[PDB]
């Protein structure tokens, strides 16, 4: 029996609810991923021109009922519960990683924010014009990394860096 199919303490080999898909859930820091933590044989990383002094990513923003603004260009009566927003946004990621819909094509489609026209792309910007806590934040993710539902003031939204 292979013991290497196990995970180090803190990591729990979990499964998707009613789906049967197996992934890795770290209950220590609450992190989650599908790639083996020690799978350093092949790391994902795209080539981006320019150092982390400026970056360019794409995001999918979903607004909920109790948001700063309950209205948008596509829906002015946005009344969706937080559980709904989470399940729909996580559902999008799942089809993306499955190669069903690309983040770009999908973001331009399901973006609740005004970034829909730009396919979720925020553009390439340099440090200075960011909020103090977010300024150093912009430069943390590299080209090829996609995070899940991040909880900021604006609401629930995912992110993917392209440059």
């Amino acid at each position: 029996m292979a013991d290497e199919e196990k995970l180090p303490p803190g990591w729990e080999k979990r499964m998707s609810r009613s789906s049967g898909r197996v992934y890795y859930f770290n209950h220590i820091t609450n992190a989650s991923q599908w790639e083996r933590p020690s799978g350093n044989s092949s790391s994902g990383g795209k080539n981006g021109q320019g150092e982390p002094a400026r970056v360019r990513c794409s995001h999918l923003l979903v607004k909920h009922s109790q948001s700063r603004r309950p209205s948008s260009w596509r829906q002015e009566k946005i009344t969706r519960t937080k559980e709904e927003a989470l399940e729909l946004i996580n559902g999008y990621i799942q089809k993306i990683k499955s190669g069903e819909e690309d983040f770009e094509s999908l973001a331009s489609q399901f973006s609740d924010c005004s970034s829909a026209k730009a396919r979720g792309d925020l553009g390439a910007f340099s440090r200075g014009q960011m909020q103090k806590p977010f300024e150093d934040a912009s430069f943390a993710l590299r080209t090829g990394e996609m995070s899940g539902p991040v909880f900021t003031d604006s609401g629930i939204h995912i992110i993917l860096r392209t440059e």
Binding site: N90, Q94, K97, F134, S154
Partner: peptide, 23 residues
């Protein structure tokens, strides 16, 4: 349970509030 890959440590980027956009 969440399912999609989400890194607790490295998840920071232009997450909307990187500018005056929205908030």
């Amino acid at each position: 349970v969440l399912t999609p890959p989400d890194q607790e440590v490295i998840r920071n980027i232009d997450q909307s509030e990187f500018e005056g956009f929205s908030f």
